[PDB]
Amino acid sequence: DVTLYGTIKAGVETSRSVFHQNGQVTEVTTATGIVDLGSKIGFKGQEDLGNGLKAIWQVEQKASIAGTDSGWGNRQSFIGLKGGFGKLRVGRLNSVLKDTGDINPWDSKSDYLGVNKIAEPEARLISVRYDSPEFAGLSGSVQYALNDNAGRHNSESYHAGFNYKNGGFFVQYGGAYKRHHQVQNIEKYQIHRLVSGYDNDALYASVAVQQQDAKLTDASNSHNSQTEVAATLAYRFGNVTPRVSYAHGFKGLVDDADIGNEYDQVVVGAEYDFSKRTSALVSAGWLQEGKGENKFVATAGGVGLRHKF
Amino acid sequence: DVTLYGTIKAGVETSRSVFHQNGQVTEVTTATGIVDLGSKIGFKGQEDLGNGLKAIWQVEQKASIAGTDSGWGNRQSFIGLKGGFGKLRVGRLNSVLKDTGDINPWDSKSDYLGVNKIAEPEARLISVRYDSPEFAGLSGSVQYALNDNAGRHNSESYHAGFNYKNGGFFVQYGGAYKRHHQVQNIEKYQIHRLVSGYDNDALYASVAVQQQDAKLTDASNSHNSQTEVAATLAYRFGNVTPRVSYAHGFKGLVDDADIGNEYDQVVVGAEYDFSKRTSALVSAGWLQEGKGENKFVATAGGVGLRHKF
Amino acid sequence: DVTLYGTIKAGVETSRSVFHQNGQVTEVTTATGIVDLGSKIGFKGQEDLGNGLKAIWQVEQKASIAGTDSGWGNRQSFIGLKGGFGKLRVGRLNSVLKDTGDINPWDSKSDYLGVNKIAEPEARLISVRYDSPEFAGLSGSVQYALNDNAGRHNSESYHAGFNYKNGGFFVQYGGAYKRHHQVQNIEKYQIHRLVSGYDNDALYASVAVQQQDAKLTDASNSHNSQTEVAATLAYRFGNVTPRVSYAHGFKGLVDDADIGNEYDQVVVGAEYDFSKRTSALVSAGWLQEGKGENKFVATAGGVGLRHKF
Structure with a gap:
């Protein structure tokens, strides 16, 4: 009882x-050309061991x-048992935050064709769930990842969420705590x-808020944190499924008063569905980051095909 | 409706x-030892979407x-639609020239056990077809690959061919044009x-000619081009399928008169077929390159098994 | 007639x-955390060609x-024919020594949770078998690997064994001879x-002895060799399968008298079997290496799940 599954997507x-x-x-x-949107192929399987333990x-x-890809298991792979008791898994895992919201419904490679900038913290890691x-x-979930x-310069993290x-x-909740962390x-x-x-x-409509908090190792040891929000909504007419999402990141908080800049973005799109599996998509995006006076502004357009087998 | 397909070959x-x-x-x-002839495994699939669009x-x-291999999709992989209208594909693709001739029917790793030296320009690229x-x-085909x-130092190329x-x-025709190109x-x-x-x-017999033209960025901006030809022929007796192919490359053309050397090669071989899928092969090759006076001459022998599943 | 096979194991x-x-x-x-025990996925297949040649x-x-893994065929992959005559294979192969003993029945990553230290010489190589x-x-087997x-600084090796x-x-025997060899x-x-x-x-019980001989390129050209032994035994009660293994490596022999240190290790474990395929395992290990006076001593504990599909 094994399954070959995958998704193939580009444009x-x-x-x-x-x-x-x-x-x-x-x-x-400026840049233009063809990109793969993130196709994956995986194998999964299960065995009935009896009394509903699988x-x-x-x-x-x-x-x-x-x-451009290389390697095996670069995505979510594991071994676990599943039961009336629950499902416990170990291996490399999507983090509990990542399961929380379809913050990004989009298929795109570029960062301006989906609400990507609020999903940077989502990750996958070697942990227990x-x-x-x-x-x-x-439903509820917790996981842990050991030091x-x-x-060497990172510390165990804890993740929990409820649905x-x-x-x-x-409504969904997901959180993460890590004792120690580092950057180059x-x-x-x-x-x-x-x-x-x-x-x-x-009818799909959703909104969510991400709050992040870190204490800098500064010689001012300055507390910092950053907030962001996003709203997405789409409704499906027949075979066609328009959607639009918006996101803002309020200025970060540095030692005291907000010092960091804030980024606004909005994405508008559609998908036409050939079949439950094959669907063809179209996107366009806008992002302005940083202050109004001395900013950064970017825009982009995405069209693609997707096949889930 | 997915398929696991592949070919396994070594000797x-x-x-x-x-x-x-x-x-x-x-x-x-001199060198001798065992080589893999280029085995591949791939997955492919299709879905009927109706009215003969697939x-x-x-x-x-x-x-x-x-x-020695690594990575996913290093060969011809894509997503496209197929129909009465045609078949349009996008992804990494065999180039239209590469489909043109079974210039090389051989299975070999060494370059003296197939007519390899006329197939150097065949490639695969990220393009639309x-x-x-x-x-x-x-039948006809065209494809394009964007800058x-x-x-950075290469320019869009166009490919077309007819069959x-x-x-x-x-008879088959395939061509390629690229605005700009570079080498280390x-x-x-x-x-x-x-x-x-x-x-x-x-009864198989074939011959084809490849003409290549490039203008050097020289401080003489000197036109250059190079020609090559090849003939292969094999006939099948019962279960055994002798074949032989020949190839010559006339001297390149540099600024004016031919300056570059020309290479001659000939390959003689056989394949015995156990089954439609499994066949076992034997090869021997000769190549002389460059001028007769101060040349390069090489020879080689190849034996192998092939299984296509 | 193709098969997807594999084993998934971690803990x-x-x-x-x-x-x-x-x-x-x-x-x-000290170190603690989660490790993958060596999961693999492979594909294999066969075709009946008739008169029992396959x-x-x-x-x-x-x-x-x-x-952490990357690449295709990093493990035992090949093409060969199988028959009443025997089975001949070529490709990258387990070496004949490696097939000889289940010297290590253990699943572990760490070297103190299986009798790993006697299996360092087992390898896989490009050869004929x-x-x-x-x-x-x-039964009997021989294989060869060309220079x-x-x-460049290694020489053909020969392997033979009998069962x-x-x-x-x-009882099983496996041996290897290599003309020339090198280290950084x-x-x-x-x-x-x-x-x-x-x-x-x-009832499983076993013991085996490994003798290794090499002549150093020294300016004393000093003969050297090293011996090791191991005993493992386990008996299965119902669904639970305790096992224990021991291993010693007598001092190496250098020019004349034993100069090198000797290492002792012992491993004790169990596996509980959910099904023929899925089994869950537990291990604990001890190793002391080198002399008693100025030694090295390590210990470790391993628990894991295994699924063979």
Whole structure:
């Protein structure tokens, strides 16, 4: 009882990114060409061990059409058991935050053709997960990743989240805490994301907020944190499924008063569905980041085909 | 409706390459051992979307037995739609020239066990392709690759070709044009290849000519171009299928008069067929390159097994 | 007639490695976290060609859950024919020594959770193999790897082995000879391993001895060789299968008298079997290496899940 599964997706995209410097336009960087949107092929399977305890595993990989990908299991792969008790898995895993919201429904490579900039913190990691069974629309999940798997200048992280559905309604919560962290160091960093909306058929709408907190190792040890929000909504007419999403990131908070710049973006799109599996898509995007006076503004257009087999 | 397909092929080969320097033999480089002939495994699938419009995709990879290969989609992989209208595909593709001739029927790793030296220009690239349906034995194809996918010091290329069959007879044409190009720069480079022959069952024979043209960026801006030809023929007796191919490359043309050397090669071989899928092969090759006075001459022998599943 | 096969295995492990320096403890290096035990996915297939001659191939790869693996065919992959005559294969192969003993039944990544230190010489290589059919419990195998596949500072190696079973009883022999060899050079190096034991159902016990001989390129050209032994035994109660293995490496022999240190290790474990395919495992290990006065001592604990599909 094994399954070959995958998704194949690519198309043509184009961008332009205009720089400002407090007076007038500094430097443009146009580009256009064909990109793969993130195709993957994976294998998964399960075995019935009896009394409703079942064993599960999967190995999944990035299979870019362009041939740029390499390696096995670069995506979500694992081994675990599943049961009335729940489903426990270990392996490399989507982090609990990443499951939380379809923050980005888009298929695109470029960062201006989906609400990508709020999903940078979502990740996959080597960890243990307990995923809860659903009672009345409540489910829950927690996972952990030990220091040694994280590394020398990184510390164990904890992730937890909860999920709620009452028919159309839903709400989801996901959070993360890491003792220590570093970049080419910050401490006691947490992130909490909450999403809610309505998704019955013929009606999708959602909004969620991400708050991130980190304490800088400064010689001022300055608290910092950054907030962002996003709203997406689409309704499906017949075979055609228009959608649009918006996102803002308020200025970061540095030692005290907001010092960092804020970024606004909006994406408008459609997908036409040939079949449940094959659907063909079209996108266009706008982003302005940083202050109004000395900014950065970019725009892009994306069209693509997707086949899930 | 997915398919696992592949070809597995390897065997023992051996070579020797003797250098001359206008007087007498300079330096020999013998080598012998086992090589993989280029095994691949791929996945492909299609879905019927109705009214004879069908959606297709594939991801294909090099799967060398020796373990030397790495990555996903390093070979011809794509997503496209197929129809009465034609078949349009996008992704990484065999170039239209590469489909043109079975210039090399051989399986070998070494370059002296197939007519490899006329197939150096065949390639695969990230592009769009329109492939024509067949009316009376005519089909046609065109594809394009944009500057950005090509790169910083390379320019979009255009490929076109046409195909003809009347029973045994066939003829094929394939061409390529690229505005700009570079090596660790040439311009306005084109190549045209024409092949024709007869291939019914029990009779294969073919010949084709490749003309290549490039203008050097010189401080003489000197036109250059190079011509080559090849003839292959094999006939099948029962289960055994002898074949032989020959190839010559006339001297290149440099600024004016031919300055470059010309290379002659000939390959003689056989394949015994266990089954439609498994066939076992044997080869021997000769190549002399460069001038007669101060040349390079090499020879080699190849034996192999092939299984297409 | 193709098969997707594989094994998926991972779990949590932990170690500590204490160093001594002729007086008292120098330096400890603790580590704990989750490791993949060596999962693989492969494809294999065969075709009946008639009169009991069958053609076989396989391509196999390391598919670590953590995503650390890359490439195709990194494990045992080949193409060969199989028959009443025997089975001949060529490709990258397990070496004949490696097939000889289940010297290591363990699943672990760490080297202290299986009898790993006697299996360092087992390898895989690009070679030809003849594997013998079984008459009365005798089978035999030989293979060869040519200089060029081995490399510039390595020389062809020869491998041979024989196998015996009379019901519970078994005995196996495997050996290797290589003319020349090098490290970042030794000569005329051989290794011989003999294993015997009893394995009917509900009773496994085994012991084997590995002798290795190499002549150093020294300006004393000093003969050297090293011996090691291992014993493993497990019996299966119902669904639970305790096992324990021990290993010692006598001091190496250098020019004359034993100069090198000897390493002792012992591993104790169990596996609980959910199903023929899925089984869950638990391990604990001890190793002391080097002399008693100024040693190295390490210990570790391993728990894991395994699914063979």
